[PDB]
Amino acid sequence: ESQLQMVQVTGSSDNEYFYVDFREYEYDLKWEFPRENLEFGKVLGSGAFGKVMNATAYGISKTGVSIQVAVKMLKEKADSSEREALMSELKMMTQLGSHENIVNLLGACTLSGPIYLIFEYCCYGDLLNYLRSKREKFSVLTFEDLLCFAYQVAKGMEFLEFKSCVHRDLAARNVLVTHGKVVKICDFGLARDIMSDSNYVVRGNARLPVKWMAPESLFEGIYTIKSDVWSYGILLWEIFSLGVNPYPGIPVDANFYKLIQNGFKMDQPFYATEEIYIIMQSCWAFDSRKRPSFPNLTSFLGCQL
Ligand X SMILES: */C(=C\C(=O)N(C)[C@@H](C)C(=O)NCCCC#Cc1cnc(Nc2ccc(C#N)cc2)nc1NCCC)CN(C)C
**Interface residue with ligand X, options 72, 168, 207, 226 (CB under 6 A):** 72
Single out the catalytic residue among 169, 228, 253, 287: 169
Q: Binding pattern to ligand X, positions 155-194, x when CB under 6 A?
A: ---------------------x---------xxx--x---
Work out the number of other CB atoms within 10 angstroms of the CB of residue 157.
28
Query: Which residue number, 125 or 292, has a Cβ lying nearer to ligand X?
Result: 125
Q: Name the residue among 60, 195, 76 with its Cα closest to residue 121.
A: 60
Work out the number of other CB atoms within 10 angstroms of the CB of residue 27.
16
47 is in an annotated binding site: yes
From edge to edge, which strands make up the β-sheet containing 4-9? 17-19, 4-9, 165-167
Question: In the complex, which residue's CB is closest to ligand X?
Answer: 123
51 is in an annotated binding site: yes
CA 56 to chain CA mean position, Å: 24
**Interface residue with ligand X, options 27, 124, 257, 271 (CB under 6 A):** 124
149 is in an annotated binding site: no
Q: What is the smallest separation between the CB atom of 84 and ligand X, expressed in angstroms?
A: 17
Q: Which amino acid is at 204?
A: G
Count residues contacting ligand X (CB under 6 A)? 18
Q: Within positions 207 to 266, which residues make up the interface with ligand X, using CB under 6 A? A: none
CB 236 within 8 A of CB 150: yes
Distance, CA of 111 to CA of 32 (rounded, Å): 8
Distance, CA of 267 to CA of 282 (rounded, Å): 13
Distance, CA of 278 to CA of 106 (rounded, Å): 38
Residue 267 is a catalytic residue: no
3-state secondary structure at position 45: strand
Q: Within positions 87 to 116, which residues make up the interface with ligand X, using CB under 6 A? A: 103
**Interface residue with ligand X, options 22, 119, 151, 223 (CB under 6 A):** 119
Query: Which residue number, 119 or 159, has a Cβ lying nearer to ligand X?
Result: 119
Binding of ligand X at residue 45 (CB under 6 A)?
yes
Binding of ligand X at residue 70 (CB under 6 A)?
yes
Distance, CA of 168 to CA of 5 (rounded, Å): 8
**CA dihedral in degrees (29, 35, 37, 38; nearest 10)?**
120
Q: Which residues are catalytic?
A: 169
Residues of the binding site: 44-52, 72
Binding-site residues for ATP: 44-52, 72
Binding site for ligand X (CB under 6 A): 44-45, 52, 70, 72, 103, 119, 121-126, 176, 186-188, 191
